Amino acid sequence: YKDIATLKNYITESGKIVPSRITGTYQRQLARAIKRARYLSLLPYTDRH
Amino acid sequence: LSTEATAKIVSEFGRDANDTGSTEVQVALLTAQINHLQGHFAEHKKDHHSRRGLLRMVSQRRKLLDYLKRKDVARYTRLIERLGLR
Amino acid sequence: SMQDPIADMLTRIRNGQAANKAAVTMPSSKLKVAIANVLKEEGFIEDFKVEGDTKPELELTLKYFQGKAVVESIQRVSRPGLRIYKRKDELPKVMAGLGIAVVSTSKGVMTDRAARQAGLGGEIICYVA
Amino acid sequence: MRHYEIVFMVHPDQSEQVPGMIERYTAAITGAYPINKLHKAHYVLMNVEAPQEVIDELETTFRFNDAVIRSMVMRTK
Amino acid sequence: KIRTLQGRVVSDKMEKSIVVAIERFVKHPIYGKFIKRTTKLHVHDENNECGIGDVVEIRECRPLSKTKSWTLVRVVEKA
RNA sequence: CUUGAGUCUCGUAGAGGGGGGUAGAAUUCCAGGAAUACCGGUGGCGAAGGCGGCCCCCUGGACGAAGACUGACGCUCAGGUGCGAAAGCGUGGGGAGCAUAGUCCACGCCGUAAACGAUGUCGACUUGGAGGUUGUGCCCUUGAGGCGUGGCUUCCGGAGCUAACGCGUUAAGUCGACCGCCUGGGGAGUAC
Structure with a gap:
């Protein structure tokens, strides 16, 4: 949830959250980890803003 | 609630060690954990979801008291002495 | 069983009379020994063995003469x-x-x-x- | 008691008042994108031990402060 | 001695007079089911020597009062 | 007496709620009302109506791995009492997204509906097959992985059953204990 590497490699370049239906993988923990991702400032708000 | 203060109240009532689910030890653990939970329903006063979970064990508190009543009239009175019930 | 031991036994036996298993088994009270010691003797089934002493329990042997089943x-x-x-x-x-x-x-x-x-x-x- | 964790965000032009604020809020330890800013700072985090009430005095001192904007508390068991 | 009809005590708020119910089985006459049925009849006794909740042996007697034609013989149960 | 049930230990997963403030991937006026884009789904929670931003606070249920002890302590329900989609109405305000109050919070009435698994509840038994998801034992774990082995939920199907259509190990199949309800249509959810 807190890692800049292991979360931003598994976000999409449109800024949004990767679905597991395309990634294929812990996801139910990873989703809520990226649900709270917006305040950490190791990421942008999204890729377009 | 569940671990800490229950561990100091368990051996207060057991006829020996690890007789935990005996009916004396049962209700006195349980009735204690209706007073303290009623501190939580001393306020919040809109949690109608969880209030039945309180209403669950209040009726079972009277259920096992029947099991003291029908078997041993002595031990029945002894714990409601120690708890001040009804 | 919950609320009749002998009724819920009689579901267990003739389900064996619908797939033709060899041996059937139910948790066995002392009344239940006195049940199948009648069915054996009149000939409707063949053999039974009680086993277990903290779970006293039976080993009844079924009896289907053909594709037809006897009971x-x-x-x-x-x-x-x-x-x-x-x-x-x-x-x-x-x-x-x-x-x-x-x-x-x-x-x-x-x-x-x-x-x-x-x-x-x-x-x-x-x-x- | 219960273990906890402290998460907050630090003002860049008053990043020089980090350890002075630390020893102020270490009293409870001993007691028991445009966000209108540069998006460049340094973080200070630690895993704390304090129970349910010793923590409650800490957060209610941040509506009187101007450097930190968001107060976030989590856990790891 | 009649059958020595066993019963209970329901209430005593009366002056030397009690209320006895009697457990009683029966075939239900058309369905064939056993309904535990109970009656309710006043019983004379003087000493107040049975309490509310006992088990009582009863025979008949001369009709003493209104609504009460049964004397106690003895009690087989404390409260 | 230990298997029905039940308490403890111990972990596990989660739109179960209540309060508290928070606050943008977004959005009209000159300020702020709203509430998720993404994850979002055949997921997942709960007794149902239901409930989705984020973190902590008091609380709710279930689950698994073992031990331990209680010795039938249970299952069911007429009345009974709670929780009760919308609106309406009451009293106390607001006014954008946009229906001119009302919708929105709130304190009181109101209990209404496709409140339709159009499938009371618990228990035990009977051919099955493929996927869901949560675990966790053994096994070079040598791994994404096998055999089990828990729990619930899908999808097609044997026997049996059903007027068919169909159901089909989460039953409607073989049963047992208990509760609700129906006995031709209209007049009618109406007269008093």
Whole structure:
């Protein structure tokens, strides 16, 4: 949830959250980890803003 | 609630060690954990979801008291002495 | 069982009369030894062995002569809450008397001939055919 | 008691008042994108031990402060 | 001695007079079911020697009062 | 007496709620009302109506791995009492997204509906096959992985059953204990 590497490699370049239906993988923990991702400032708000 | 203060109240009532689910030890653990939970329903006063979970064990508190009543009239009175019930 | 040990046994046996398994097994009270020590002797099934002493439990051997299976139509009648204590000169003969009629007499459970030989009826346990 | 964790965000032009604020809020330890800013700072985090009430005095001192904007508390068991 | 009809005590708020119910089975006459049925009949006794909740042996007697024609013989149960 | 049930230990997963403030991937007026884009789904929670931003606070249920002891202590329900989609109405305000109050919070009435698994509840038994998801034992774990082995939920199907259509190990199949309800259509959810 807190890692800049292991979360931003598994976000999409449109800024949004990767679905597991395309990634294929812990996801139910990873989703809520990226649900709270917006305040950490190791990421942008999204890729377009 | 569940671990800490229950561990100091368990051996207060057991006829020996690890007789935990005996009916004396049962209700006195349980009735204690209706007073303290009623501190939580001393306020919040809109949690109608969880209030039945309180209403669950209040009726079972009277259920096992029947099991003291029908078997041993002595031990029945002894714990409601120690708890001040009804 | 929860709320009749002998009714819920009689579902367990004739389900073996619908897939033709060899051995059947149910948790066995001391009444339940006295059940299948009648069904064996009248010939409806073959052999049984009680086992277990903290779970006393049976090993009944079924009996299907063909694709046809021998125990055709067994029915419990006196179900709890509908006791039918038969006086003996009413007695249910099962299928014009061609079967047997398991009656809980005083002198035991083994009952074809309580009509004349023993001479006292009681609660029906189950018809057997 | 219960273990906890402290998460907050630090003002860049008053990043020089980090350890002075630390020893102020270490009293409870001993007691028991445009966000209108540069998006460049340094973080200070630690895993704390304090129970349910010793913590409650800490957060209610941040509506009177101007450097930190968001107060976030989590756990790891 | 009649059958020595066993019963209970329901209430005593009366002056030397009690209320007895009697457990009683029966075949229900058309369905064939056993309904535990109970009656309620006043019973004379002087000493107040049975309490509310006992088990009582009862025979008949001369009709003493209105609504009460049964004397106590003895008690087989404390409260 | 130990298997029905039940308490403890111990972990596990989660739109179960209540309060508290928070606050943008977004959005009209000159300020702020709203509430998720993404994950979002055949997922997942709960007794149902239901409930989705984020973190902590008091609380709710279930689950698994073992031990331990209680010795039938249970299952069911007429009345009974709670929780009760919308609106309406009451009293106390607001006014954008946009229906001119009302919708929105809130304190009181109101209990209404496709409140339709159009499938009371618990228990035990019977051919099955493929996927869901949560675990966790053994096994070079040598791994994404096998055999089990828990729990619930899908999808097609044997026997049996059903007027068919169909159901089909989460039953409607073989049963047992208990509760609700129906006995031709209209007049009618109406007269008093």
